[PDB]
Symmetry: none
């Protein structure tokens, strides 16, 4: 954290892409580490909590995932993917109430947003599987 402070936007951007690419290739603990650092270097780029969360998810780290997602949501109240993946976390914690609120928030948030139409559906369908049960 110490000597890596002060980097420019162009570098921060490329660093994220690196984390994102390792995330795709399934190198999740490496990706975690990268996002953790990025979340150290800028506490207002939802993207980095999206990434941190997702790495933890794919790691089986549901509670921890849940924490990133929740802070991200506080930082970007429009991003449907926070309440959506939180809910998949809730589901694996075996918390049906939380998963239902989450898919409901996400479906809602996602419907106003032309970019997220193909996830609004996904949330609506998860929502009615959790209804029962």
């Amino acid at each position: 954290l110490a000597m890596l402070r002060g980097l420019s936007e162009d570098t921060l951007e490329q660093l994220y892409a690196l984390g994102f690419n390792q995330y795709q290739a399934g190198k999740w603990d490496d990706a975690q580490k990268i996002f953790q650092a990025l979340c150290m270097l800028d506490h207002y780029d939802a993207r980095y909590f999206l990434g941190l969360g997702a790495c933890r998810q794919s790691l089986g780290l549901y509670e921890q995932a849940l924490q990133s997602y929740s802070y991200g949501a506080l930082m970007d109240i429009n991003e449907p993917r926070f309440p959506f993946h939180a809910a998949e976390c809730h589901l694996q914690l075996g918390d049906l109430d939380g998963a239902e609120s989450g898919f409901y928030s996400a479906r809602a948030l996602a419907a106003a947003q032309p970019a997220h139409e193909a996830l609004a559906a996904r949330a609506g369908a998860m929502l009615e599987a959790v209804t029962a049960r």
Copy 2:
């Protein structure tokens, strides 16, 4: 942004004490601005987020305070004042659930930590109150 980068550890510490006295003295908007500058200049220090959060409370900006304390707890799991103070904001915001977790988690970490004894009791009593 705030090109006032590269300050020595001695200087950041007095700038921190300076925010602290502004807070103490009810100069909150001002103290707020100092803690934000500090969060943004120096390596993580919990006291920065703890002051920012505390300034926002006293200004009645509970959402904003929650962000602060929630970043604190996300990076600093064993600090109990992050969940404790977050719970307080949950109260004012109309979220009894949020408040109940916070206080309980605050109590737990707080109970183990001989230093933070009063936080333990304070978090003790708060939980009771909230349950009904």
